[PDB]
Design a protein around this ligand. Sequence first.
Ligand SMILES: CO[C@@H](C(=O)N1Cc2[nH]nc(NC(=O)c3ccc(N4CCN(C)CC4)cc3)c2C1)c1ccccc1
Length: 273
Amino acid sequence: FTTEIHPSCVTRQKVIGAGGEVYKGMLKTKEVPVAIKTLKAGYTEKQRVDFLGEAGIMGQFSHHNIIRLEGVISKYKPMMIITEYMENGALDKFLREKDGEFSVLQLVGMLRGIAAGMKYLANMNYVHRDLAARNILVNSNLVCKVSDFGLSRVLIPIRWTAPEAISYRKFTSASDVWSFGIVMWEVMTYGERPYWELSNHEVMKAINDGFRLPTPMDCPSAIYQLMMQCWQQERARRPKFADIVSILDKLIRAPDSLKTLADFDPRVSIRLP
Ligand SMILES: CO[C@@H](C(=O)N1Cc2[nH]nc(NC(=O)c3ccc(N4CCN(C)CC4)cc3)c2C1)c1ccccc1
């Protein structure tokens, strides 16, 4: 049972997104900021199962890097899912708005947090299917938390998705590891679009041909090596999230290890005599 919140305790203050709206608001239980997702009159049976299913999933979880469920409004209409407020919004937009503003150690710490959340989910037998920086939220302590929970409602996003999931719909924690590799590239590039302007068909062709994303600028060699191992075609060869967490924790605890950078391939020549 999730916590049932009375609507008098919830003050919607401003629209912060869509998913039928997501609000920033306050929750009285002194008041605390929350995110508030609503479900309007006329919702179908499937919408209700998906909506409360998302809450039911999140209520089973208790981890630092997983968005916390404060409670639900289900006895009154419109129904609401109330979650912890993440002041800095989605990670992809956050990185793009803060280009170059963080240390390599901060960026890798963000990835460690995401990986710890994903290790928790996988161990809990939850396959995310839509892991991407756009679905990771950032708070005012720079902590990154996996969000976007549900079933059929979360989705395919081709350039984040593992080949076996594209080709025959096999979604597992190992296809989430592939996605996590893409998220590593997103973070280290401050939110560049994976595969830039290649079309979805061109991306799948490139992957099948063996091509992989090139090294980000200023990227520790150990970090590029780890994301490349996330992108092994053979599922069984990919690291598990336990391995990823272990490696990232060891790199962070010996931070001089991150000063060794992978070579960056320039896509431009500048010659000055
Ligand atoms: C659709 O569900 C929401 C959801 O569940 N959630 C739960 C939850 N908690 N906290 C949230 N914060 C924000 O959505 C948010 C958005 C923009 C924001 N500002 C925008 C302008 N920027 C310049 C500064 C930052 C600041 C905070 C959300 C959303 C969701 C949204 C995005 C990714 C994952 C989930």
